[PDB]
């Protein structure tokens, strides 16, 4: 009596809801992983900052005195 299209569309809508739920789960785990990796990587900003500071320090130390060697 009811149009079969209605039933089949309800079924496929249920499938699409389930799939969206799975997508949400996956994206949540991805966000968790990204947060963890950034929190652990925070030390690399420190390391890069100090290395850059030292590089600039030696560069201007070779500038200040005339001890900067000629370009090979």
């Amino acid at each position: 009596m009811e149009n079969p299209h209605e039933q089949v569309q309800a079924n496929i809508l249920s499938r699409i809801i389930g799939n969206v739920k799975r997508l949400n789960e996956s994206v949540a785990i991805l966000n968790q992983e990204l947060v963890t990796i950034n929190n652990r990587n925070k030390n690399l900003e420190i390391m890069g900052a100090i290395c850059d500071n030292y590089h600039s320090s030696v560069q201007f130390n070779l500038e200040a005195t005339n001890n900067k060697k000629p370009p090979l």
Partner: protein, 92 residues
């Protein structure tokens, strides 16, 4: 001018004493000669080539090894402190 034997012994002992006196004086001088490779010589005698001309030569560049690491670490700490004080003062 005759002298007593004890006086003569005193005198030639004095002579020998003067001899090694000027010997030691010459030795101390030769240490103090900054004439390293200026006069005929190939050994270094303590002089600016052992001092500021040399040790300072070392020092004007040893800072690039020891004090520059610290300086960089201190600069990062100072920048962090600046960020912290800015955020703390402006947020409230």
């Amino acid at each position: 001018h005759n002298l007593s034997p004890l006086q003569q012994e005193v005198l030639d002992k004095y002579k020998q004493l003067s001899l090694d006196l000027k010997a030691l004086d010459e030795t101390i001088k030769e240490l103090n000669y900054s004439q390293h490779r200026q006069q005929h010589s190939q050994q270094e005698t303590v002089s600016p080539d052992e001092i500021l001309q040399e040790m300072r030569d070392i020092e004007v560049k040893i800072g690039l090894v020891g004090t520059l690491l610290k300086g960089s670490v201190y600069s990062l700490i100072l920048q962090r402190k600046q960020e912290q004080e800015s955020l703390g003062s402006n947020s409230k």
